Amino acid sequence: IDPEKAKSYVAPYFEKSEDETALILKLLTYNVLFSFLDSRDLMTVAGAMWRVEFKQDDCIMEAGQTTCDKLYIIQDGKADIIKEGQKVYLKVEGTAVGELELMYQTPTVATVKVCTPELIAWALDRDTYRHLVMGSAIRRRETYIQFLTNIPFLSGLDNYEKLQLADALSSDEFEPGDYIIRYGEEGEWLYIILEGSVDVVGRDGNEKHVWEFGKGDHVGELEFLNNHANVADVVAKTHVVTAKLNRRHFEMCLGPVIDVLKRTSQQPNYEYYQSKL
Numbered sequence: 358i359d360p361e362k363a364k365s366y367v368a369p370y371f372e373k374s375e376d377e378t379a380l381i382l383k384l385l386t387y388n389v390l391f392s393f394l395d396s397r398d399l400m401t402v403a404g405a406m407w408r409v410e411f412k413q414d415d416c417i418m419e420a421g422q423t424t425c426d427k428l429y430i431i432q433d434g435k436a437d438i439i440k441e442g443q444k445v446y447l448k449v450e451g452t453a454v455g456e457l458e459l460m461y462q463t464p465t466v467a468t469v470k471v472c473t474p475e476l477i478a479w480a481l482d483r484d485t486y487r488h489l490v491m492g493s494a495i496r497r498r499e500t501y502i503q504f505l506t507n508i509p510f511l512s513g514l515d516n517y518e519k520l521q522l523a524d525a526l527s528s529d530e531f532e533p534g535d536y537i538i539r540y541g542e543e544g545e546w547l548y549i550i551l552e553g554s555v556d557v558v559g560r561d562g563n564e565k566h567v568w569e570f571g572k573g574d575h576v577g578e579l580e581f582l583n584n585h586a587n588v589a590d591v592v593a594k595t596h597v598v599t600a601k602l603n604r605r606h607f608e609m610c611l612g613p614v615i616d617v618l619k620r621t622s623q624q625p626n627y628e629y630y631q632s633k634l
């Protein structure tokens with residue numbers, strides 16, 4: 358995609374009710390594919406979507422076809438991902454199907470079979486997806502996936518899921534002394550430390566040193582798990598490079614390792630954190 362061609366691309370518009378547009382935007386907001394669009398782009402994308410109904414056992418797309426030039430975001434229902442006759446993944450409400458073929462321009466990798474009495478989805482055509490949504494997804498996936506296969510708490514994600522997490526990550530560089538996370542404030546970001554060291558500075562206020570973390574560790578999830586303001590600062594001790602994830606996408610991206618994060622917070626290195634609770 359030429360950037361100028363993406364700039365001047367006029368998306369189709371398919372009239373729909375205010376209620377349907379609102380429901381679409383809620384789906385686009387939590388789905389990883391759209392994490393970098395601003396409001397006007399989200400509105401345009403929603404205008405280019407149209408509603409599709411499937412009944413149980415329908416194949417939305419079939420492995421090996423080349424004719425499917427669309428993305429589907431699931432509103433209601435579930436679908437099986439079937440490779441070589443085996444169910445290998447389950448797509449639930451709010452997730453998308455078809456993105457791999459739109460990104461990479463290959464034939465349909467897997468068969469997607471509705472396994473609920475009905476499935477209601479919203480479809481998006483190849484050109485709108487490529488011009489308005491894709492952006493630099495392919496570069497983000499290729500960049501981050503080298504680091505993500507070495508992050509301990511992400512072992513519980515399969516390969517497809519690690520790549521999908523890359524869709525919603527964004528990098529930041531910090532300098533010795535920079536506050537990455539600041540006590541008392543609202544948690545919105547989960548940070549993965551790709552390089553450097555950081556200090557967890559708690560309180561009791563009393564400014565008390567809690568723990569030191571480094572390459573491969575994560576910070577910020579405690580506020581996601583338990584919905585409370587930051588119980589501690591996180592301060593760059595060296596130059597730190599991070600990839601971060603917005604709370605929006607916490608469940609969609611890390612669902613399969615949310616249980617590991619719970620265990621981790623019940624370790625002794627969270628004595629400070631246990632006692633505050």
Ligand SMILES: O=c1[nH]cnc2c1ncn2[C@@H]1O[C@H](CO)[C@@H](O)[C@H]1O
Binds near residue numbers: 445453456466
């Ligand atoms: O390994 C997978 N894990 C999870 N979902 C997959 C996988 N492979 C494919 N899809 C889903 O099936 C669609 C059609 O091939 C893809 O676009 C993707 O949404």
Ligand SMILES: O=c1[nH]cnc2c1ncn2[C@@H]1O[C@H](CO)[C@@H](O)[C@H]1O
Binds near residue numbers: 576628629
């Ligand atoms: O007791 C602790 N031990 C280790 N890390 C902690 C502890 N408490 C908080 N954090 C880290 O600091 C962030 C801000 O609250 C938490 O989300 C977590 O990443």
